[PDB]
Design an enzyme around this catalytic site. Structure first.
Site, mmCIF file in Angstrom:
data_model
loop_
_atom_site.group_PDB
_atom_site.id
_atom_site.type_symbol
_atom_site.label_atom_id
_atom_site.label_comp_id
_atom_site.label_asym_id
_atom_site.label_seq_id
_atom_site.Cartn_x
_atom_site.Cartn_y
_atom_site.Cartn_z
ATOM 1 C CE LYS A 213 21.000 11.318 1.914
ATOM 2 N NZ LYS A 213 21.798 10.530 3.312
HETATM 3 C C1 PLP Z 1 21.279 9.441 4.298
HETATM 4 C C2 PLP Z 1 22.771 8.427 4.529
HETATM 5 C C3 PLP Z 1 21.884 7.488 5.653
HETATM 6 C C4 PLP Z 1 20.563 7.677 6.657
HETATM 7 O O1 PLP Z 1 20.214 8.348 5.778
HETATM 8 P P1 PLP Z 1 18.462 9.132 7.011
HETATM 9 O O2 PLP Z 1 17.207 8.760 6.360
HETATM 10 O O3 PLP Z 1 18.723 10.532 7.168
HETATM 11 O O4 PLP Z 1 19.069 8.082 8.057
HETATM 12 C C5 PLP Z 1 22.987 6.851 5.052
HETATM 13 N N1 PLP Z 1 23.456 5.700 4.604
HETATM 14 C C6 PLP Z 1 24.209 6.970 3.345
HETATM 15 C C7 PLP Z 1 25.645 6.470 2.526
HETATM 16 C C8 PLP Z 1 23.608 8.195 3.650
HETATM 17 O O5 PLP Z 1 23.471 8.950 2.428
#
Ligand code: PLP
Ligand code: PLP
Lengths: 367, 370
Positions: free
Chosen positions: B182
């Site tokens: 992210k």
């Molecule tokens: C990253 C991801 C998640 C979950 O994120 P985590 O922090 O890894 O649990 C949920 N929704 C989307 C669209 C994602 O890309």
């Protein structure tokens, strides 16, 4: 700056250097450090499978889930434990069956387990309390006779041995790497098991239910997210390398408390009669107002005013609002007696001899 | 491997290591003042009232839906075109996901598709802000309001995303992710923002064992069973450094994305379309659609050949309803725009430590493989 907490982690240049290596690699979540930690715990325990998880609570959640525990099932557990286990049992829809503990070591006995077994029982969860092992062979024998798995809560028992092997050498056990635990990565846990099928399910259920139906990975059944980042796994590896020396120092401190509190009314836990090596995660005393001239709560307050922290491990679960109202019939006399009287005094390996002297002096003054 | 260009890599440096050193020296390594500071920082970033740091966005979703009372007999409207965590959390609370299609060119749900899927059993709507662009959240929210249905925003891709001049999650409830890929990361973590006081109180308790103070001031005890999804301060400190870096990181991501937009315009690879509503794109992912009829190569084979050239790619995402559990439990689901894209998308390298030559390498390979 003069405050002496009941626990503090031992973080230093080695931990910072492990973090540097993970950050420099660019691979910060689950990766090679997870694999190394898991192999290290297999080598530590001699068990076959190790699964690193984000917390021992999450580990318990997925272990019970992988065993199929759900509505209609009973799980035997002490009340004298942390509420995570009871909560996980409930949040799977199952029913915790709370049983009493031995009055002097706070661990469940095989007899109390056998008496609580019903046709609904699907798991037994003994707790290795304070760094001592429960009599796991005898508890396992009860489970075997009835065909009921035993899942060991080993949060307190990194470095605990039982009859010459590390806790979790066989069967299934769950360790914690929370900040107050004997080895820590702030938050983390790890499951060991000798059950191939259970280990395969757990590994999927802690990472979104993903699996192979060789086709690519996809959701085989819904699962949770309880994987451990490599940042944290790297810290855990450093702390496991330190664990033998850390436990040695904890034992020296605990030895001194046992000796120098022997002529006080404060009553430590009793050391079990079966063969073991105590990890000395906590040093618990019972404070009985009639014997000590001071109550547990007041002892904690006055120690705090003197700059000395204490912990309460634990307020028995069945005394807490949700369980008290859901399970009002539960009456556990040894648990209730101890729950009202225990506290944990400072025990951690960065304690100096003078820190220990300060604690002992204060307890002698307050008795 | 030293010459491998992955599709994402974190920007971890001395600032992060100095934040970690501070936390370790302090001896307070799990949830503490760094959590509080991260939460305050997200209230200042978004402008919303409450911020709750969690161990992952997945856990955030789990406890948010749980705190709303979602359970058996309730329907939750969600795209299939998203990560499987949301669908899994709905199911594992005993609720029923109602999968709807997405716009064929930005991969986000529309207010029309939401309205068409509402029933008397619907208890939440979960739009996804996809790839760094916001969904048309005012229109989705208006549908929710008209029917009395809460909208919970999946904002994992949307740290730094603006909509109509405000940060995503300025009002309402939104969930951010700090996973390794992210735009800001603490390896694993997440954060919930909400304007709902009661929801925030419930969430805070349910991510830390259900502990609370009983009414009628006593010590904390279990009021109702909860989970363990608190974020350690070691991780919160990293996230604070990465949030301080987020404006510059997102500026660099936008520069790379703009270059991809321009220099792929004369290729048959088809980026997502930029929404017509006013926004600031965070550029979490640079997605292309690879249709063998137009491109002369399939999505899978492009990913394989790129990998052979030392170029990584990702698949964000294989639609949930095409995956075994959901395909066998919900075989009736037929979502043409989702199915068309899911078979054709991939994410090409986009992260701010990419150099201009890294970007040229990707562009050149795409031109070669057309
Ligand atoms: C990253 C991801 C998640 C979950 O994120 P985590 O922090 O890894 O649990 C949920 N929704 C989307 C669209 C994602 O890309
Ligand atoms: C804290 C504790 C747990 C839960 O461990 P976490 O790593 O914090 O999830 C389980 N059992 C016992 C006895 C504990 O003390």
């Amino acid at each position: 700056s003069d405050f002496l907490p009941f626990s503090r982690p031992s973080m230093g240049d080695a931990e910072l250097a492990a973090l540097r290596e993970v950050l420099q690699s660019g691979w910060i979540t689950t990766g090679p450090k997870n694999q190394a930690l898991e192999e290290a715990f297999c080598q530590l325990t001699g068990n076959r499978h190790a699964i690193a998880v984000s917390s021992a609570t999450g580990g318990m959640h997925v272990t019970l889930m992988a065993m199929g525990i759900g509505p209609g099932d009973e799980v035997i557990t002490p009340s004298q434990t942390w509420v995570s286990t009871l909560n996980m049992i409930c949040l799977l829809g199952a029913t915790p069956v709370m049983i009493d503990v031995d009055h002097d070591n706070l661990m469940i006995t095989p007899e109390a387990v056998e008496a609580a077994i019903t046709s609904r029982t699907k798991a037994i969860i003994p707790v290795h309390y304070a760094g001592a092992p429960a009599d796991i062979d005898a508890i396992r024998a009860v489970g075997e006779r009835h065909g009921i798995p035993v899942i060991e809560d080993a949060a307190h028992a990194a470095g605990t041995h039982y009859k010459g092997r590390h806790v979790g050498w066989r069967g299934t056990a769950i360790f914690s790497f929370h900040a107050i635990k004997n080895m820590t990565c702030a938050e983390g846990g790890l499951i060991v098991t000798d059950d191939d099928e259970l280990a395969s399910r757990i590994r999927s259920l802690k990472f979104h239910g993903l699996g192979v139906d060789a086709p690519q990975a996809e959701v085989i059944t819904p699962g949770f997210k309880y994987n451990l980042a490599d940042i944290n796994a790297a810290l855990a590896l450093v702390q496991l390398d330190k664990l033998a020396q850390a436990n040695q120092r904890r034992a020296e401190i605990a030895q001194r408390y046992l000796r120098e509190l022997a002529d006080t009314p404060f009553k430590p836990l009793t050391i079990p009669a079966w063969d073991h090596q105590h990890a000395w995660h906590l040093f618990i005393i019972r404070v009985d107002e009639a014997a000590c001239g001071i109550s547990r709560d007041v002892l904690m307050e006055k120690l705090k005013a003197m700059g000395i922290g204490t912990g309460l491990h634990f307020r028995a679960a069945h005394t807490q609002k949700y369980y008290r109202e859901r399970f009002p019939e539960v009456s556990l006399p040894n648990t209730e007696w101890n729950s009202a009287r225990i506290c944990s005094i400072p025990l951690f390996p960065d304690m100096t001899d003078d820190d220990v002297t300060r604690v002992i002096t204060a307890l002698h003054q307050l008795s």
